[PDB]
């Protein structure tokens, strides 16, 4: 059968574009699919727009093309209380005219549209043009089951979710501690709550849902999404675990971090990074600085100014005391390259799924320090279910983590026999992930099943 054309729509931000590009890459190379990426961007001045200028919009063999789609300016449509979830929904809504015309001009219409979590409002455009439409859930199956079931919790639960004193029971799935609810569930009176319940229903309107997870990681929740009688009252279409999708390493030979790592022993270094979406209070940054020093472990720490020469933000004499023990890297690092280095033995992260996937596919265990979005659910999975992470006694967003506990966690993970058990479990998940993505593996098979659904709908 002849070539399929699939357009994938990314919402604004590198955090959304990159996984879309990774999916596009996998579909064009291993699945004979011609890919168009519709990369919705902000009006101006984005890390994303800079990326798109430095990179080429098309590849050698004309199998992938990136079409930047700039949104309009939304600053007049928001205020200081407007949450990120709401802002993303609004940026895509405002780009719908330009998404519509972009698709209209495509003489060879796409055989299918795959849209981001934050692009489900494109659904009526797919309808209008008679294009098969699928959505891509860029994080765990557990969080997908929450979004879809939330419309039930909304009618069955009277007050704030955060005030419940019993787990929320997702049929057939892990029960959810009220402390761990995703961000939009923290305040039902906020606009983003209703937007989130709406999203959970919009999933149901698609022809299928791709998930950035794999069968062996979440067998219970995937099986529930497929067959559980209560969830299937709500979800009528298949799910496709096609992950874990992760960006490729792009080397920089003269990278001083990599040079410093090259001189360390195997699996001896704690990488500490809260990414771009992460900041700590002044008080928390001080405790983290002291915990790292007190641990006497090797570390690489990506530092950013705190929020209530990086020397101003560290304890007096920090860089002198920790010379030879630790590297303080300012603002940014090649994270995927660092996590693949043989000297890295642990990762203190916020548990964003992209970061988690980059860690697990390198077999690196974690200290789970969730901050926002769906990270508390990710952290709960990594520590309670998967056994590849340790964590503070109390959520960092509830209580200050003190230097003593941080010292103790770094030690447990990097020195004790317990930490070695956690590292071995992470090495097993690395293999599970590799198997899933291999030819004939579960995520490979799920892509073939997706392609069959697309073809079937054109008969
Ligand atoms: C803080 O706003 C966010 C909330 C959620 C919730 C579930 C999810 O799967 O992703 C999210 C991404 C976000 O930026």
Numbering used by the authors: 3 to 310, 327 to 477
Paper text:
NbUGT72AY1 is a promiscuous transferase that glycosylates bioactive hydroxycoumarins such as scopoletin and umbelliferone, as well as monolignols involved in lignin formation and various other small molecules. Five distinct GT protein folds have been identified that are capable of GT activity (termed GT-A to GT-E). NbUGT72AY1 adopts a GT-B fold comprised of two distinct N-terminal and C-terminal Rossmann-like domains (shown in cyan and brown in Fig. 2, respectively) of seven and six parallel β-sheets, respectively linked to α-helices, connected by a linker region and an interdomain cleft. The catalytic mechanism of inverting UGT such as NbUGT72AY1 is a direct displacement bimolecular nucleophilic substitution (SN2)-like reaction enabled by an enzymatic base catalyst.
Moreover, NbUGT72AY1 crystallized in the presence of scopoletin (III), UDP (IV), and a mixture of scopoletin and the non-transferable donor UDP2FG (V). In all structures that have scopoletin bound (III, V, VI, VIII, and IX), H2 has 2-3 turns while conformers associated with UDP (IV) and UDP2FG (VII) have 4 turns. The arrangement of the Trp350 side chain in the 3D structure obtained in the presence of scopoletin (III) is clearly different. Binding of scopoletin (III) or UDP2FG (VII) results in the conversion of the loop (loop 2) between Ile42-Leu59 (green) into a helix (helix 2), but differ in the orientation of Try350 (blue) (Trp-, π interaction with uracil is not possible; Trp + , π interaction), whereas the closing loop remains flexible in both structures (yellow/red). The complexes with UDP2FG (VII_E and VII_B) show significantly more interactions within the protein than the structures with scopoletin (III), which is due to the increased number of van der Waals interactions. Starting with the apo-enzyme (I), two different conformational changes can occur after substrate binding depending on whether the acceptor (I → III) or donor (I → VII) is the first to interact with the protein. Structures III and VII differ both in the length of helix H2 and in the spatial orientation of Trp350, leading to the formation of an unproductive SI complex V and a catalytically active complex VI, respectively, after binding of the respective second substrate. High scopoletin concentrations lead to increased use of the non-productive cycle, eventually resulting in SI.
